[PDB]
Each structure stands twice: as C-alpha cells, then as structure tokens.
Design a protein around this motif. Sequence first.
Motif, PDB file in Angstrom:
ATOM      1  N   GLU A  58       4.829  -1.953  -2.455  1.00 48.11           N
ATOM      2  CA  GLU A  58       5.848  -0.800  -2.325  1.00 48.11           C
ATOM      3  C   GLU A  58       5.236   0.386  -1.843  1.00 48.11           C
ATOM      4  OE1 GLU A  58       6.227   2.364  -4.927  1.00 48.11           O
ATOM      5  OE2 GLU A  58       6.522   2.569  -2.888  1.00 48.11           O
ATOM      6  N   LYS A  59       4.076   0.796  -2.566  1.00 46.08           N
ATOM      7  CA  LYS A  59       3.378   1.853  -2.038  1.00 46.08           C
ATOM      8  C   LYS A  59       2.823   2.012  -0.757  1.00 46.08           C
ATOM      9  CE  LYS A  59       0.566   3.475  -5.278  1.00 46.08           C
ATOM     10  NZ  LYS A  59      -0.803   3.797  -6.021  1.00 46.08           N
TER      11      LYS A  59
ATOM     12  N   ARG B 183       4.962   2.541   2.050  1.00 47.78           N
ATOM     13  CA  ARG B 183       5.131   4.130   2.251  1.00 47.78           C
ATOM     14  C   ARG B 183       4.337   4.781   3.151  1.00 47.78           C
ATOM     15  NH1 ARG B 183       5.635   8.388  -2.241  1.00 47.78           N
ATOM     16  NH2 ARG B 183       4.263   6.965  -3.205  1.00 47.78           N
TER      17      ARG B 183
ATOM     18  N   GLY C 253       4.951   2.897   6.418  1.00 44.41           N
ATOM     19  CA  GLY C 253       6.098   3.215   6.733  1.00 44.41           C
ATOM     20  C   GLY C 253       6.850   2.413   7.913  1.00 44.41           C
TER      21      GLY C 253
END
Length: 47
Positions: free
Chosen positions: A37-38, A41, A44
């Motif tokens: 998830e991190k 980002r 992206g």
Amino acid sequence: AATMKDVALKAKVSTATVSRALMNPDKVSQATRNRVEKAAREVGYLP
C-alpha cells in the motif's frame, strides 16, 4: 519512473501476487500488504 512490477522484486513479494493484485488483491501477507500500500504511493504507478 518505477513500476508496480519493479517493486515486487524489491519487496520479494511474488510474481503471482503482483499479477493477482489485479485479479484478487487479498492474498498478500498482512505485513507485506501494508508495505505494498505504501510502496504503491511511492511509485504511484499501477496500470
């Protein structure tokens, strides 16, 4: 200019996981799941 695929190798996830991430994104380990998830980002990028 990274890619969700390159991250898989960096996090030694699994060729199937990253590939299933579009079919069934609910098999990744809890710990490994939070990292993705991190990590998503940061890059992206997840066509």
